[PDB]
Amino acid sequence: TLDLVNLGVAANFAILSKTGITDVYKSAITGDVGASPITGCAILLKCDEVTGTIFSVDACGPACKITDASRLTTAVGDMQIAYDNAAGRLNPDFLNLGAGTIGGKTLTPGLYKWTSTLNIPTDITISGSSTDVWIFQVAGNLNMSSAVRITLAGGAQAKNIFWQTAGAVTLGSTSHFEGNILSQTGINMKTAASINGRMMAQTAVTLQMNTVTIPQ
Numbered sequence: 001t002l003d004l005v006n007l008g009v010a011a012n013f014a015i016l017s018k019t020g021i022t023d024v025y026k027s028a029i030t031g032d033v034g035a036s037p038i039t040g041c042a043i044l045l046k047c048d049e050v051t052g053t054i055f056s057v058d059a060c061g062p063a064c065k066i067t068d069a070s071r072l073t074t075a076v077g078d079m080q081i082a083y084d085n086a087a088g089r090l091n092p093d094f095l096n097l098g099a100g101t102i103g104g105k106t107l108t109p110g111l112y113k114w115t116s117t118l119n120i121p122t123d124i125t126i127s128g129s130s131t132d133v134w135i136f137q138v139a140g141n142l143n144m145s146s147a148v149r150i151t152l153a154g155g156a157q158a159k160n161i162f163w164q165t166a167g168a169v170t171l172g173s174t175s176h177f178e179g180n181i182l183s184q185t186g187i188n189m190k191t192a193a194s195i196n197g198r199m200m201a202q203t204a205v206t207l208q209m210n211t212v213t214i215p216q
Contacts, residue, residue, distance in 0.1 A: 002110055002133040005086045005162045007180065008078030009071065010200055014052065014214040016079055017187075017201040021045060024191075024208040031198075031214030036072035040065050042204075079200045083182045086164035089135055106153070113137040117167065120144040123151065126178060130155035134162065134179070141167035142181075146190070150178040158196045158215035171195065173208075180215070 010016055014031030020042025021035055027045070032052040035043055040056025047054070047064035055072050056065040093110030100114055103122030109132035117140035126134060134156075142165045144150075152158065161179025163169070169183050173190035181187050183201045194211040 002089075002135060004133055004160065005082050005135065005180070005182070007082045007198070007200075009075040010079040010082060010198070013075060013198060013200070014212050015199045015205050016075055017199075017203065017205045018076060019204040022204065022206045023049065025049070027207045027210045027212065029210075029212045031212075034072050034075055036069070036076045040067070079182070080202070082200070083164060083184065083202065086135055086162050086182050087137060087166075089137065092137065103148075107134060109134055111135045111137070113139075115139045117141045117143065118165075120148050120150075123149050125151045125153045126156045126161060127153040128156045130157055131160070132156060133160045136161075136163045136179075138163065138165045138167070141165065142169040142183075144171050144175045144177060146172040147174045148172060149176040152178055161197070169201075 012032050013034050014029050015033040017035045019038050023044050027049045029050045034055035036057045040058050040061025043061050047062050054062050054065045056067050057069045089111050092113040094112045100116040101119045106125040106127045109128040118138045158178045163179050164182045166184045168186040171177055171189045171193045175193045177195040180198045185203045187199045187201045188206045189210040191208045196213050199205045
């Protein structure tokens with residue numbers, strides 16, 4: 001029933017930011033990474049940290065980098081269209097579920113909105129079919145605590161989950177996240193946190209020894 005958020009060319013990236021990608025070595029990224037319009041030197045990943053292509057707007061950046069301004073321009077533009085599309089969905093199924101703390105919940109499909117910061121202090125399940133869609137609209141920050149795991153149940157797929165945040169995302173140390181993040185600012189991961197999803201930030205993505213896998 002709820003339509004997918006079309007990511008266009010941004011679908012090809014595990015990490016896409018506008019002001020760079022910082023990293024505490026070593027991270028494990030599966031899929032392409034990019035930043036635009038910032039210089040490629042703002043991508044602080046080593047070549048042995050990415051399975052995929054590192055894209056740069058210029059001659060600057062990691063040894064393996066491909067320079068491709070035009071593809072990054074399209075990807076970032078596509079990321080902004082996706083952000084606006086996700087932020088623009090009307091008629092939420094839920095508004096202010098758990099008063100902004102959703103620890104222990106099982107989330108069924110649909111459109112969710114929070115006019116605050118969303119916190120996830122304890123494990124949650126996202127439960128639905130291989131074709132169901134979840135859009136989470138968050139007017140503040142999104143926080144997940146250390147060791148918190150998002151579990152998928154019933155055939156729910158990470159590629160059908162979208163998190164739209166007006167504020168910064170903070171994934172706590174050793175936490176496991178599921179879904180696409182469309183952040184208006186930063187996405188900040190802590191020591192050994194993992195994500196099955198895409199990190200699309202209109203500022204920066206920051207990593208500390210993270211595992212990042214594009215959804216299949």
